[PDB]
């Protein structure tokens, strides 16, 4: 069941409708891609639930003191206070966001083994559970290959499993046996794969994996925007933590990393706000030199590109987002799309953290994965009522840098992303109303092709047609 | 069905959830009376809609824009305009809420009846199709006895009636005539009658009765906390108006009154406010009087107890309660509410605008009226989930001002008061379950009775004790 | 020397000009009393500095999170809780401001000494070191007489001395005598006395004060609106507290009085805000009283007439109001231009906490205390610089309620009513200059008469010619 | 009346606290002798800089309070995008969360494309401005193309007066676009208040002769607008041909003279966040393009970059906001004063420009070297003095020559007294002058300093040193 809010609203933004028609127009006008349409002529916004949820009063309260200074501002202790109690980090710097970290990072632990252990630049490869677009856009920026080792169950839609967001452990030290441990600049855990489809990943695989790195000396970085909705996961799963708290839980994840990179614009609840953090005094080194590259991305390092008041938002959010009641709430509203899609013929992935993932390729299997079957499901439920989505499939995946042919993609999904405390059990009927028209016409559904495409990144602003 | 919000949710406030035993205690610690609780020991509060429902960006931003000059802040005419616009009423004077207009009107408009038309003021009797519990308060606190003619059809809990709240024209006019028109100081028109059950005014209703008291020359002040349900219900149900906007209509309602009083806090949607305006030159004096006795009891007129902020909210609150979508989603959760009572067994008032109204009368028979049984059933319902809610009966009425007896009451409810935008479809449903439990053990509710009794508006903050 | 802010400006209003030929319309279509002048005619507004003051970015951030609930809001027991650690008082009920809480008690208070002690009505006589224009309005509408018991060199303005809001200590004592002990409902001690100039008390002589009324048994009520102003002045010149923290002072100086009334738009520094709160059990009567009439008149007493951001922000600025840098900022300004006004020839009482009161007596010595020569002084200061001030002498005063004469008034004062932390140094230096043409013009400015006169309170709303 | 009453009122405070001279001494040096390594609470009256520490307007902070937080078409988004057009006449836009951010984007973008379009020769490559930020400098720098500052020779001369210190030198600029070649210039920069040469104005003449030259090369125009609102007010007040007109209409036609705009608008436009980085036309649409895709990496999708809505609405209000006449007149009018007090107490400084007082260290402390960094001594020992924290505007922000690996040399050795838009009052700026009384009394016994760190990139910031 969906559960009730453990909350009560207190501001609202109006939103409107429009009619099919306009849509119609409104879809081609967009080259085929969600991404392009006004926010006007979305109704349900599932496109993101990155920096789109609700705040808390008490976060709402703290962005109206913040201290705006351009050094040392006192908002930059109250937020490296929170992240060293609930992280356990003695180093913080504060970055916009997601991407603003990890264009920081990626340079700077490359150079630091290539000086260190002879890193070769020209076949280094980095690893991770799954790496988010961005991370892998960056990475390849400078130069890194990257390879995702996840596990078998991962992407079988078919088949429930504990934890798919889970390190596929032989599969890592194989990899880092092949390419060379001096060629292997980092491993990123992402905490709740995001493209396995919000997919927990349990302590002990994380304990197992940050072994592995220790062993061959590989910086680990904690990708973090979902932090939170992993240690409910971990809570409800792994049989060793059911009693612990969410705080009690994160504190115990961050002890197999080195370093966390986080968009906060997710389980912090922000509408802005990024974190690059390293956890002690072995890493001081990493800690100065991302300093010194964030005066240049950035901002000076006690900011970040963040105005003070939204570093006291942040000191804040970090916690509220851990709040037990909530996360149940948040992970049930979830979980009752998902079933209630399933109810209807829609094959999902199991229900994540932050979204439901529909498994476009189970449900248009007429359409070849070349022609982004999951981004022609998301226009053609715009088109229906309303209801903007993206697609986690081949569209997103990219071609290979290298080859220049389009990447394999184990899974064409759609995914309805779910912003925090935004929509109502009403909101999430009216999304699975809506599959019942989609699904009626899946077999009509035309397959996509570019006549626009950007050389990085391309899924946010390229178009299609077809 | 229940509509799907037309707005996204943008600020959260986290609630908590407590034991039966805990409520078991709490319950008995508050002398049986709800009002008594503490707010962290609520998880759904429908004690009321006022000041409690949520507000929009628009409203939240006016908020940081106000003029607190003490006099001539330009916050004052944002709001002025407003209700010119809106109302077409040229004269403003904002209060810092319901209670603080009436306490400013009511004196006013009995002594200038005293002193215009001789009024005896041992011998004055105010009509409304239904006063508010602090209208009718007010009024006894002023020696002025009060007289509700409601219709036939407004407490028929069993019966279907498109406006309940309507007056009973006969009944008014032949009130008048046994009190004698120069004893008359006002009658009051409540916009949404709220104890008939949040029931609708028809825009016709309006105009035979503000003929009627033109007639009589008695002043008539249009009670206006929910002034945008009464013209949504009048743009359904009244085939003159299908077609009318929410604006228009409330434009055209308010021909038919001399002046107004509302309590900003219901749909205009703010958290705290009040306005008490007159039409026009000819109520001039009784604006000027009103002036001077908000000094007094409110503050300077052109804040009257609102912070420039406030107002500023207000202006805009005003207008964004009328939007159609929100105000037939609004009304449509209620009605799904409603629905999911009366399918589970549990008999109501039909659907008004801002709360299900429960037949506590039908539902505990074997409690007479003088044992407040809706107000056994508020604390059964409270024990029951951790709602919150107000009996609107016996309990409420009070005692006879004259005879010290306690009045006759057409209807022992118990009012679940939704506040706007704060709970959504799943908290209805929540609430319709906690009902299965509370009918189950309807039988075996005890009644109540005092064991501390205010003078005035008892129902606050008084304290029972069962059977 | 006006010390520099000990804070940052972080929000600001923008304000217009206008010229002389537009005020001099504008005065005249007020009826000669800037009460009436709209906001946006005025430059510099003096009126009061009641509720127009600025406020801090915690008080703005406490406004965010207020429980709105209509009963036992969170935000109420917030706001409780302050009053008891400032005051020590454990009894509190919110109103939305001052007269709000004076329509409570007053009628309270009367009827409790009529049926405990058999108070006469027809001969009750309320007294206080001076009372304040609603104070004895709501007092004088209950049937009740007042008496203001200062102090000979209260209204002295050529006279310096240390606290000319003191209670005449003999006066009152003989006074009660007089009037019988049994017909005194309470005494009402007025923490910075504003008619005498924002003058403060000692707090030698409210433990004397109190020490009169625990004999007769009569209810002491603290007029509070600028309590923590008064608690620098005692610390600056009561030899006892020199070394005592604004909070100690505060709290020793109500265990003086029974209750308390406060206007919290003053040193509170909220733009909206009043309390009515009981010292202890022993008015615990008084208290339920209170909360049955304050059902009638403000609301539920949770909330009394105050959103729950309301009390929050209340909540905190009792506390931020007492901030010694603060306070000692505040007074050094209002006493720059008190210095300012003396050295141009301008003689004022000497300078109080909240306001420079100029001597229109002493200034326009021409014009007769019956034709109002402050508030022809306040139009010559508008008319001259867009200027806003008011007038605290006979104009204000009133008429004698039973004589239906006017009042004898003690002193004629212009009051540059100053708000908290809203003008700077500039503005004062301006505020100086205007002065400097308002009294080269003295001995042609004419006194005034009424055109309309409400019957109570009339100051507010009246309107007058020549 | 020199310094203006505020034409506004106090509405919103945050206090400060004070410390002891012990205390300062203590925290100086362990900030490595740099204030910029200095905790905001260790500091009374922070002149630090004049960027997203200023006050905001109540429509300002009304506007942020409905924004439209959605990833894609914000109609916060248009909302700011109708402000540029109205404003500048620019029809793209794209919102970046500051300064740099636009900066990261179109140095590379424009770089690219005189390489694809003419041949550029990025070992060859010079890019030109009136004056170059430090972050300008450094981003094109780091894409590998050199800098060069044609400024006017009056420009530094603080002990000369001119209108417009800011002002490109025409001939100098014509001079070494010939020298270096025009298939090898990437882009001029015009900095709309030339910040290094102590916030002096440009005037509207010598800005169409400027585009006028890079027109004949068709070199790329990019308007640093940071402080568009105060150049324009001395526009006004100066340039005879503008002297009726509005900040609105100056800003107008200045923008014709430009083929795009990067802007910090945590300055003039008064937020605590926010950039902008927009193109005027059809003509530069596909920069535009080029732009936002490079935007969705450094920044974010390009309808927000790295801004949350509500920042988007308040921009869109701050813009306008800040070209109130009434303020710049007031705003500029407290920089003039403290000015004119310093310089009565015997401080020379350069004339008053917009947002700050620029102390000439050089002249006050001629026993120290360029290569000690006077300037930056002087700003540790007004720190030590009162608790005021200022910037140097030296031979220690200039750096080292990229190429060369030695310390560039510098036209002025400036301690700049950047005052946040709206924050401090006039006693703040006697507080000002009364600590300088003490500074310059002991102006000869302030010793040079040297580094201890000295990071390889925009070193100033977190560099640490000790005296030599
Ligand atoms: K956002
Ligand atoms: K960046
Ligand atoms: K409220
Ligand atoms: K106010
Ligand atoms: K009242
Ligand atoms: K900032």
Redesign the interface.
């Given at each position: 069941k969906?559960?009730?809010?453990?909350?009560?609203?207190?501001?609202?933004?109006?939103?409107?409708?429009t009619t099919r028609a306009y849509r119609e127009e409104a879809i081609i006008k967009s080259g085929m891609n969600?991404?392009?349409?006004?926010?006007?002529?979305?109704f349900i916004?599932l496109?993101?639930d990155?920096?789109?949820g609700?705040?808390?009063?008490?976060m709402?309260?703290?962005?109206?003191?913040?201290?705006?200074?351009?050094?040392?501002?006192?908002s930059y202790?109250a937020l490296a206070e929170s992240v060293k109690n609930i992280f356990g980090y003695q180093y913080t710097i504060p970055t916009?966001?997601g991407?603003?970290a990890e264009?920081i990072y990626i340079p700077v632990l490359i150079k630091k083994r290539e000086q260190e252990k002879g890193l070769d630049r020209s076949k280094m490869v980095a690893f991770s559970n799954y790496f988010f677009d961005?991370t892998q856009?960056?990475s390849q920026?400078n130069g890194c290959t990257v390879r995702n080792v996840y596990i078998k169950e991962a992407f079988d839609t078919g088949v429930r499993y504990d934890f798919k967001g889970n390190f596929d452990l032989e599969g890592l030290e194989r990899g880092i046996e092949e390419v060379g441990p001096n060629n292997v600049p980092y491993i990123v855990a992402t905490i709740t794969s995001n493209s396995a489809g919000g997919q927990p990943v349990s302590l002990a695989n994380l304990k197992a994996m940050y072994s592995i790195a220790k062993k061959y000396d590989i910086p680990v970085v904690m990708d973090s925007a979902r932090f939170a909705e992993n240690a409910y996961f971990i809570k409800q799963r792994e049989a060793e933590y059911k009693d612990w708290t969410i705080e009690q839980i994160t504190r115990e994840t961050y002890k197999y990393a080195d370093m966390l990179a986080m968009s906060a614009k997710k389980d912090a609840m922000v509408?802005?706000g990024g974190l690059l953090c390293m956890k002690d005094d072995s890493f001081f080194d990493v800690y100065?030199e991302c300093?010194?590259?964030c005066?240049?991305?950035?901002?000076?390092?006690t900011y970040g590109?963040?105005?003070?008041?939204?570093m006291e938002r942040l000191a804040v959010g970090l916690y509220?987002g851990m709040?037990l009641?909530?996360l149940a709430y948040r992970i049930a509203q979830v979980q009752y799309l998902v079933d209630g899609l399933e109810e209807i013929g829609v094959v999902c992935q199991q229900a994540g953290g932050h979204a439901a993932f529909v498994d476009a390729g189970k449900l248009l299997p007429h359409i070849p994965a070349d022609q982004f079957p999951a981004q022609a499901l998301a226009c053609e439920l715009y088109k229906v009522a309303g209801i903007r989505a993206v697609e986690i499939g081949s569209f997103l995946l990219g071609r290979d840098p290298k080859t220049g042919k389009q990447l394999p993609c184990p899974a064409e999904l759609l995914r309805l992303t779910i912003?925090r405390?935004?929509?109502?059990?009403?909101?999430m009927?009216?999304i699975i109303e809506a599959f019942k028209h989609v699904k009626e016409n899946a077999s009509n559904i035309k397959g996509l092709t570019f006549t626009y495409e950007?050389?990085?990144?391309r899924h946010?602003?390229a178009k299609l047609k077809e």
């Open positions: 969906h559960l009730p809010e453990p909350f009560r609203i207190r501001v609202i933004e109006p939103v409107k409708r969600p991404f392009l349409l006004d926010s006007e002529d979305v916004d496109l993101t990155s920096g789109t609700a705040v808390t009063q008490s709402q309260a703290a962005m109206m003191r913040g201290d705006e200074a351009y050094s040392g501002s006192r202790y916009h966001q991407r603003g264009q961005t856009g960056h920026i509408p802005m100065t300093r010194t590259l005066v240049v991305q950035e901002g000076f390092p590109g963040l105005e003070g008041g939204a509220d709040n009641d909530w912003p405390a935004t929509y109502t059990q009403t909101h009927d009216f950007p050389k990085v990144l946010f602003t």
